[PDB]
Amino acid sequence: PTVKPPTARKFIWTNHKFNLSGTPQQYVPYSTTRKKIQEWVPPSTPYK
């Protein structure tokens, strides 16, 4: 890359990171979607 540099982008990491597994910077998986079924909110008033 001193002779043929890589094609620069605005999103390519300027800070490359090594393997983070076992550290507090490691990947923890999670569902990337929102709540499917919306639940009913009961009213906050007395029914009398």
Partner: protein
């Protein structure tokens, strides 16, 4: 343009964030929630609207066989720009 819930947890570009009363935040305790801070929906608004002089334009996103299939975009509406379905680059007939 990542934002943050009142729990301190970052919100993904989907809109996913765990609730305050949701126990599944315990997977991020002592660790990190990995989010990508380069939102595509924020970075496609930064693109300039391409002013052209043709009525039907074509987009393959660049690269030819390195982009997406070449679609043809109509620019008859003077109200709305013409958005590519794949790349999101939007066009306008300049008249």
């Amino acid at each position: 343009g990542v934002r943050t819930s009142p729990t301190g947890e970052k919100v993904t570009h989907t809109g996913q964030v765990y609730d305050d009363e949701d126990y599944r935040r315990v997977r991020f305790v002592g660790r990190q929630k990995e989010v990508n801070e380069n939102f595509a929906i924020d970075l496609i608004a930064e693109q300039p609207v391409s002013q052209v002089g043709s009525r039907v334009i074509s987009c393959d996103g660049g690269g030819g066989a390195l982009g997406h299939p070449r679609v043809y975009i109509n620019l008859d509406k003077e109200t709305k720009t013409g958005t590519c379905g794949y790349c999101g680059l939007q066009f306008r007939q300049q008249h």
